[PDB]
Amino acid sequence: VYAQEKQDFVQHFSQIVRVLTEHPEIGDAIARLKEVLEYNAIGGKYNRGLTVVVAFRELVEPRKQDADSLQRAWTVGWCVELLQAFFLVADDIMDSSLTRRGQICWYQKPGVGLDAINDANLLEACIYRLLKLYCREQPYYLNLIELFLQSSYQTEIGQTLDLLTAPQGNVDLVRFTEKRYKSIVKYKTAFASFYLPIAAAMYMAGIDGEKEHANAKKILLEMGEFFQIQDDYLDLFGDPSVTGKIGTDIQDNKCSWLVVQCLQRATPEQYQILKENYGQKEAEKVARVKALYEELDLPAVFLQYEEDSYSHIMALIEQYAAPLPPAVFLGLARKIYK
Amino acid sequence: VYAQEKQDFVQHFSQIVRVLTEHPEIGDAIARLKEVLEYNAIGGKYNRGLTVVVAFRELVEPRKQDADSLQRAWTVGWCVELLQAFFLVADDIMDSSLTRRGQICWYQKPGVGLDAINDANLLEACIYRLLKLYCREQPYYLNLIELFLQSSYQTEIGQTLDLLTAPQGNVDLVRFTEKRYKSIVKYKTAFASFYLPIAAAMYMAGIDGEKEHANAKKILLEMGEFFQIQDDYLDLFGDPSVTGKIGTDIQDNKCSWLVVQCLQRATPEQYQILKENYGQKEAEKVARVKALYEELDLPAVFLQYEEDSYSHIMALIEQYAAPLPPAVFLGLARKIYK
Ligand SMILES: NCCC(O)(P(=O)(O)O)P(=O)(O)O
Ligand SMILES: NCCC(O)(P(=O)(O)O)P(=O)(O)O
Numbered sequence: 001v002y003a004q005e006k007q008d009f010v011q012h013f014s015q016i017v018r019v020l021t022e023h024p025e026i027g028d029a030i031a032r033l034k035e036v037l038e039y040n041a042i043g044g045k046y047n048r049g050l051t052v053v054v055a056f057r058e059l060v061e062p063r064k065q066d067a068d069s070l071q072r073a074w075t076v077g078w079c080v081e082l083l084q085a086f087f088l089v090a091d092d093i094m095d096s097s098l099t100r101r102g103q104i105c106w107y108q109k110p111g112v113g114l115d116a117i118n119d120a121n122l123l124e125a126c127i128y129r130l131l132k133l134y135c136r137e138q139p140y141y142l143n144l145i146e147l148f149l150q151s152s153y154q155t156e157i158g159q160t161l162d163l164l165t166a167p168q169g170n171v172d173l174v175r176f177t178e179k180r181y182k183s184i185v186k187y188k189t190a191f192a193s194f195y196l197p198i199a200a201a202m203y204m205a206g207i208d209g210e211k212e213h214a215n216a217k218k219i220l221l222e223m224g225e226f227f228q229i230q231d232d233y234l235d236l237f238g239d240p241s242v243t244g245k246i247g248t249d250i251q252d253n254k255c256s257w258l259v260v261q262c263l264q265r266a267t268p269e270q271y272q273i274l275k276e277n278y279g280q281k282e283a284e285k286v287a288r289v290k291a292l293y294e295e296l297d298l299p300a301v302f303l304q305y306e307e308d309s310y311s312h313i314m315a316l317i318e319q320y321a322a323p324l325p326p327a328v329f330l331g332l333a334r335k336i337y338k
Numbered sequence: 339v340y341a342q343e344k345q346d347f348v349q350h351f352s353q354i355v356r357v358l359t360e361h362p363e364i365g366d367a368i369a370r371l372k373e374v375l376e377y378n379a380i381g382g383k384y385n386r387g388l389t390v391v392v393a394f395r396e397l398v399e400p401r402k403q404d405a406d407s408l409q410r411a412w413t414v415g416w417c418v419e420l421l422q423a424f425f426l427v428a429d430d431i432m433d434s435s436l437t438r439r440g441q442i443c444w445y446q447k448p449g450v451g452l453d454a455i456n457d458a459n460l461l462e463a464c465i466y467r468l469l470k471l472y473c474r475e476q477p478y479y480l481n482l483i484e485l486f487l488q489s490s491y492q493t494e495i496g497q498t499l500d501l502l503t504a505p506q507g508n509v510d511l512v513r514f515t516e517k518r519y520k521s522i523v524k525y526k527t528a529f530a531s532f533y534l535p536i537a538a539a540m541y542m543a544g545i546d547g548e549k550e551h552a553n554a555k556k557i558l559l560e561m562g563e564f565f566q567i568q569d570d571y572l573d574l575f576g577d578p579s580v581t582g583k584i585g586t587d588i589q590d591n592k593c594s595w596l597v598v599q600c601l602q603r604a605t606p607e608q609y610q611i612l613k614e615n616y617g618q619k620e621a622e623k624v625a626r627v628k629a630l631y632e633e634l635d636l637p638a639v640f641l642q643y644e645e646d647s648y649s650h651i652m653a654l655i656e657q658y659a660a661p662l663p664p665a666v667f668l669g670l671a672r673k674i675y676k
């Protein structure tokens with residue numbers, strides 16, 4: 001059912017690679033592009049890319065869903081997956097991460113290293129190549145170009161706020177507030193992970209109205225915040241065999257949802273333990289932070305937050321879904337809430 | 339004269355920064371964006387950015403050069419400078435460079451490091467922000483967006499070929515051929531440094547014809563090749579007080595014009611010296627390579643190549659300038675040939 005939706009989307013990847021890797025001496029760069037694409041855009045759940053396709057099929061009249069229109073829909077879905085790949089290749093370098101999607105991070109691969117910086121930019125370039133190849137004659141062409149560009153700018157502003165609040169070797173507990181946290185996740189995750197795929201399908205369906213996009217945004221940016229909060233919870237308490245990646249938030253001095261909650265509940269003694277042990281590479285210091293989170297019942301605080309968040313997002317769907325089919329937002333809510 | 343053209347272009351930078359750095363909690367990210375912009379887009383000769391303005395003034399009828407049209411011209415000129423800044427911030431990381439434009443490389447700055455990866459992407463994002471803010475209602479809007487996107491993709495393919503031919507710790511003398519060299523520079527430099535600013539002004543002047551852009555390209559890509567050959571010559575034989583940067587091509591195992599010329603002229607003994615000493619960090623090995631280049635009269639070979647190249651580019655101007663004013667290409671030829 002959901003795995004069959006997944007299978008149909010994945011089966012289009014081979015064609016995406018062929019169209020992108022189709023001049024001889026430059027063939028070595030194209031062979032490297034193929035390796036970058038295969039290593040990084042394949043191995044995930046493809047939820048963002050699939051959201052484009054599922055939303056498109058639910059927003060466009062079935063008699064208008066011809067072979068070429070569906071081809072454009074899974075191409076844009078794959079552009080969303082490429083945008084995620086570009087950001088994650090770079091994010092893994094800047095966060096000093098080890099693994100991603102069950103394998104070593106592209107930059108950690110022997111023979112890759114900081115050449116991954118240019119590889120990340122190539123993934124970004126592939127989006128606009130695919131949009132030109134498949135959507136240049138469509139009335140929503142410029143809307144899609146501007147949407148991917150604006151989503152990248154917002155993510156990058158978010159990444160800047162994330163990195164500025166997490167300086168290496170500096171105590172930044174005073175800056176780990178709820179207000180700072182909400183602004184970081186709004187920009188670094190909410191815009192590109194949730195608004196982008198639904199907005200892309202909306203534009204392809206000819207739904208270009210400011211009011212409709214603003215209403216969809218009201219639901220989706222709140223869903224984006226939950227998704228990042230769950231990502232911060234899983235960084236420490238998730239199973240790496242399930243998440244496919246090793247957590248680094250504590251070592252990286254990140255303004256995680258966990259540290260924000262810790263500081264709101266900590267006694268003066270607990271604050272001192274957090275101050276002495278946070279943002280450092282020493283395994284025993286990281287372990288001390290985890291023990292403090294468990295002492296403050298942060299896993300239980302997360303489960304209560306997830307319940308309260310799900311009800312809030314469902315209340316936002318009742319308020320702002322119209323005139324779009326509620327199934328567009330309910331499908332996405334089912335996939336992110338566990 | 340040329341310094342007054344330069345001064346007028348530089349005086350618009352303060353407005354570019356204000357428009358880009360104009361939401362409070364996110365203010366810290368905006369303050370970082372301002373620091374990235376001031377450190378990296380200021381300190382150069384601004385030749386690419388000025389080329390847009392000079393070409394625009396020479397291609398557009400003076401009665402059509404109103405205040406708003408000129409404002410759009412120096413804004414696009416600054417978008418070209420931003421594109422260069424994005425690529426150079428990243429290139430300095432991947433080439434392990436120390437200095438640029440007379441100061442330490444942005445990534446080498448204490449407190450910056452690999453966060454410069456996101457800073458480079460922010461510079462790239464600023465191009466499309468400025469194009470939307472100043473050119474969205476112009477008929478050449480999409481032509482400019484697609485031109486900057488295509489120029490970035492070609493540069494990135496070029497950067498891939500550059501990095502693949504220069505593996506760290508691997509002997510790659512067999513791959514340092516004239517054919518490989520010509521393909522690397524065509525993509526990594528020629529397209530974005532020479533075709534882009536003239537094409538941008540051409541589109542702003544309403545010159546959008548395939549034939550006209552192809553003719554301009556025939557001159558400009560050849561000029562781009564010369565510029566990269568001079569860049570490779572200056573990497574070793576240039577004065578860092580004049581170039582503003584320290585050479586790393588020998589240490590980085592790069593397919594430089596110098597090593598290509600060395601291999602074409604080397605005796606079996608000289609080839610062995612090059613093989614033992616190229617692509618390594620040891621100062622005495624780098625010195626041994628430089629001595630071999632001087633023994634093979636490569637500085638004299640470069641001066642003869644520069645003379646032969648200047649005559650060839652001037653012959654290309656006589657063939658392909660029409661119907662554009664030859665001054666458009668002659669101005670650029672004067673600034674790059676020393
Ligand atoms: N949002 C980008 C990637 C992350 O979610 P990830 O946990 O590295 O996948 P981050 O926590 O670095 O923000
Ligand atoms: N073209 C990009 C930058 C260079 O010219 P630069 O010498 O680093 O300025 P490269 O030699 O790395 O190609």
Ligand SMILES: [Mg+2]
Pocket residue numbers: 091092095097
């Ligand atoms: Mg990360």
Ligand SMILES: [Mg+2]
Pocket residue numbers: 091095162
């Ligand atoms: Mg991160």
Ligand SMILES: [Mg+2]
Pocket residue numbers: 231232235
């Ligand atoms: Mg995370």
Ligand SMILES: [Mg+2]
Pocket residue numbers: 429430433435
């Ligand atoms: Mg360099």
Ligand SMILES: [Mg+2]
Pocket residue numbers: 429433500
């Ligand atoms: Mg380089």
Ligand SMILES: [Mg+2]
Pocket residue numbers: 569570573
């Ligand atoms: Mg160089």
